[PDB]
Amino acid sequence: KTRKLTNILSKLIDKTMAGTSKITDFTPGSASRSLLEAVSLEIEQFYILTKENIDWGIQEGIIEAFDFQKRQSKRAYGDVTIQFYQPLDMRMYIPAGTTFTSTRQEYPQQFETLVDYYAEPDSTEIVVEVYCKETGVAGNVPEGTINTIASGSSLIRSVNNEYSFNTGTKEESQEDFKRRFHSFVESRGRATNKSVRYGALQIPDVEGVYVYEETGHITVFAHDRNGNLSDTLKEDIIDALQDYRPSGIMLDVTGVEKEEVNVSATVTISNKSRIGDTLQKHIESVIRSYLNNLKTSDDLIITDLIQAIMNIDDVLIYDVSFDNLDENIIVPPQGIIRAGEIKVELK
Amino acid sequence: MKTRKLTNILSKLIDKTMAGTSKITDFTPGSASRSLLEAVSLEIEQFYILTKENIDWGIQEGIIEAFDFQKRQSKRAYGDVTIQFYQPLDMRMYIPAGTTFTSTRQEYPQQFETLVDYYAEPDSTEIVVEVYCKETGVAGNVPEGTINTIASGSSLIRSVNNEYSFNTGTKEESQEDFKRRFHSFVESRGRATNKSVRYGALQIPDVEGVYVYEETGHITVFAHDRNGNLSDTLKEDIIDALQDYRPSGIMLDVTGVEKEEVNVSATVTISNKSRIGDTLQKHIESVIRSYLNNLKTSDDLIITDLIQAIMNIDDVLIYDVSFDNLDENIIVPPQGIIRAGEIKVELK
Amino acid sequence: SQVSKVGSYGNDQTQFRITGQSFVKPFMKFGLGVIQEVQAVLPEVGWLIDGDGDNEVKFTGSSAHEVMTGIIRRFIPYMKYNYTENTIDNYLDYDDLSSWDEFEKLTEVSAFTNFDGSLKQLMDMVTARPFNELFFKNSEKTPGKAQLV
Amino acid sequence: NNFIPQPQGLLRFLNTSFVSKFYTPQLQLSELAKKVLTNIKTDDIPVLEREFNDNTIIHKANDTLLKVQAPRMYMILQSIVLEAYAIVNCFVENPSSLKYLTEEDVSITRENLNYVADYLGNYDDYNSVVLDLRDLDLCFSAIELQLPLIKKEA
Amino acid sequence: QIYESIDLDELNENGIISIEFVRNRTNTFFRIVDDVTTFNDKSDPVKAE
Amino acid sequence: RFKKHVVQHEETMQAIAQRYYGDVSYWIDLVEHNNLKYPYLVETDEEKMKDPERLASTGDTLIIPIESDLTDVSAKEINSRDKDVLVELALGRDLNITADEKYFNEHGTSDNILAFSTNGNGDLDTVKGIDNMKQQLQARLLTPRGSLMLHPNYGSDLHNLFGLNIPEQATLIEMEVLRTLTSDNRVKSANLIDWKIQGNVYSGQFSVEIKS
Amino acid sequence: ANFLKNLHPLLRRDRNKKDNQDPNFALIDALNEEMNQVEKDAIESKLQSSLKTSTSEYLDKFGDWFGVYRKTDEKDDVYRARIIKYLLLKRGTNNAIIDAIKDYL
């Protein structure tokens, strides 16, 4: 590990005294002591150089191999061209640090020239590179915005940038880069339920895909497009999932069906004076919303329905029963519960 | 006076602001004008909400002030304890009011004290005395067999224990309870009615459960505390306070309470096949006990109410509940009260 | 608790000096003495709790704030004085007390642990120094009156 | 979880077409939410045998019928509480969970918070919850500005 | 009153006195702007002010 | 807080830390503040053209913390990236209300004189850095001592000091202006450099020492 | 409450006649309008804060407090009178029980 100025200088002194008998004075001012101090300073700087290199390596050097790009807050830059009234007759000077101010009032962006340029004796046009003062995405500017120069001259006519500034860059934290690479590493999963689900969700118009697994066959069905699946989407997704399916295992794709439930429930209220059209309408709306929001292959347990309908208000409701619902309704894997016809009686 | 959500205010504000000029229309999140107007609309939204809440509180306070029906404060916890002597007693020995009782358990450091004296009869061997908890709230509802010692000399006392739990320790009444109490109060202004006698006998703070049974030429009142045991002092206080609501030409009697026993057996199919051990079953039994013991004489056991109570647990955990014994609603006689007996719960 | 003339007439000057203590005087002076020859019997009746008839008093609590409340409350009201307006309980809050309730079990601290000592001597035992800090200081939350911490 | 238990109600709550003129969500689980949520789902966590503090936002959500009336928005509130719960745990204990949260993950919670806050404004049952979530909306913005800075400090 | 800051150029410049509203702390919120006279030519201060 | 500096012909990064902080040892933490890659200071600009933002070369500015903020990691992180935005953050940003600069200098010690303005597009104008200070001083000076609705004893009695233009009144005005200016802790001192009279017109100027 | 009073003296308090567009005044006018509208709501809440004039949600709150539930398609004018009558119900006597038939006819 890195060692500081003091340890290197002390080692140099001790080894000089061990080797050299000629030298004995080490006051501040000896040519030899400061010769050694110069050596030690350069050694310490090389140590800090290696330290910084190691820090970069541990931070992103191993990940750089795998194809992703790192950003280091590089300020925006782009080619810009200047024009003059007549061809020049002298080698005009263009200082570094020259400011190209925005012509548009709404754009407070400004740019500066890092390196000096010397116009030719007779060239009517010259293109130079200019870097923005402000880092980030904020330094991006649309085309045809840079048309003013601070160090103006009689010969100078106008300025323009044909190409837009695309090199605007913003730097994120180590976590966002590490997350992007993980997203790729995890994408390199295949022949699993989760991987199959991700690969289906990759393609657009795929949402709420459900997977049913069996030793014999693997069956996938979804209500991605407005609650319905089309044949064309089935064809497309069958071909896509070939890379995802296990080798030697059959893959099958089918649509989603629904089972409309008919229910005529009865509710006893402790305080009969409270009953009204609005109350029963709200109860029916709550019941139908609850019955609509059911997960795929979710059995309609009467117990949950009882809990749901009673949880509207414990003081209000005293007793509940269902005229036309015997027990819980079992549904296949591909079936989903829907509200067909609901009626609520008040007692 | 109505709510207006932040974005509604903010939009109205910017819409008004843009009148008469067009050198402002840039409201990205980075803009400072947007931030200021977001902060103003946030404050106006909060003002409206606090105004509405304060209006509700004012309504409640006026309802308090008009009829002088103040909300019940914190209610003390009390019960009964058994004193056990080394030998049967040799003299008419005495316990003064304000004798302390303390539980040796570190988890329940709350103390208790007596309010009325008692004399033990000579040659007696046990005595039952009432103890009132200094603290008021949930901490008075200690489990069974919690009060071990009397925290004194206890020369002639061997050990002290309590056979029943404390249930009268309760927190301050919520808004809903106060509204229910007040609607009965409003409906109880006319005397000589059952709904009137309900408030008549419920006015005592300690009473929780209360029911009235009527016949051709006699009225009877059934009431009890949360523990479910009537006391003679409570009966006397009821008789003293209830004179202003008693029917003139019909006799009244305040007595009568019996503990109806039922055994509840249920089958629960947890959605997670893992973690189906008796620890969760202990919790489920304790929840069922707390539910059943909370009923009163005027309530009656209902299957659907029990199902709601036990299914308060998240429906992702418990997927199905069924009863092997209970198939119909049980009707409680007016004098009796349903409560938990010995409960048995199993997975399948 | 003291007022005295002072003056050196050699230097031709005199003054009056007054000194006192911040509410430590009542406790320090109140000595829980011992009474030796009192039976306090009754004809064919007696108290089931022991330590009765005699002046024994037992204080019980699972924490210092529980014990100290009982200790202070036992004697504070009856310590009466000639204030035109109250007694020490109005001028001393002695509230917002706490201690290590979790680590301390139940206590049976006796009144007469110290023979004819002051309440301050008995207050020290309850404190169990240095684990708990006891002192008298002004009440910043309620200016105009003192507080026992 | 490592240090102290948690209330039973919060453990039970956490384990599980409207449009605004200013906001749109995206249902991303934060990386820290992804690994803390598994621990909540598993039994390896202490838990308390009693509940207090009935004024918390959790009981408010429970009391209202938001579950059945708008289960979508009920879901988003669980997501908000999941991220909000985790970022409270790391500072008070287990600092090793740091460098697993990024300003983008914290940023989108405000998107989701205001996308639900407008919806809550349409039904003045939920005022008690609205009032609460608005306070947290400024709570998170402070953490976003300091999170890149705090991470380098720690 | 009608007259405010821009009018308190117009009137004063034409040699008419008026009282100005200052919102706070100055004793009565009101102070008098000038001591110009009704004479036409303001260049000479003995006549003018 | 910080001090400004510039890169000189073939000056080494060691030399700077030694001259300002005494010990050469501190250069190591000092490079992180200026966010420099290994070639921390390099003579040639066509070598700065390698990756311009991560280096300094001859004629470029540098940042030099005070020694207390040298070891702070937050000061390191902020100075690394903000660069020239230091001065602006350190002396503040707020809305510009000097919309009518020609006008407010015709009616001072009268109310209703300042007003919001618009710069850029679709956003209220804002001022920063030294001009943040020119604004606040000019407004504060032209505000009477007890006229803001909170935190009074703010402003000046300049509206009260009109008098017979004899020199004692002029010294009184000088002292009030100096008190006015020296109220803000951000300014070190003020001193007069000229006071001058033209019949019924006062004129004078003040030099203020603003912290670096 | 007067946002044009009660503020920093230099911020100009009525628009510039000198040119057409004045963002300063547009802002002050918007803000003054918003908080004046707030003030008017807070004054208008006087009627809602009393049972004698409460309407819409607040009257339903009052009726839930008193226990008298609103009937379907019931207007506030008759609902208030109903509540007042029910609070002062006259029942228990044979004549009162007979006279209560008017509410059951």
UniProtKB/TrEMBL annotation, chain B:
Q: Which residues form the Baseplate protein J-like barrel domain?
A: 94-169
UniProt cross-references to InterPro entries, sorted A to Z: Barrel_Baseplate_J-like (IPR006949)
User: Which Pfam families does this one have?
Assistant: Baseplate_J (PF04865)
Q: What is this protein called?
A: Baseplate component
Automatic annotation (TrEMBL), chain C:
Superkingdom of origin = Viruses
Q: What is this protein called?
A: Peptidase C51 domain-containing protein
UniProtKB/TrEMBL annotation, chain D:
Q: What is this protein called?
A: Uncharacterized protein
Give the source species.
Staphylococcus phage 812
Automatic annotation (TrEMBL), chain E:
Tell me the domain of life: Viruses
What is the protein name for this chain? Major tail sheath protein
Portion of the full sequence shown: 442 to 490 of 587
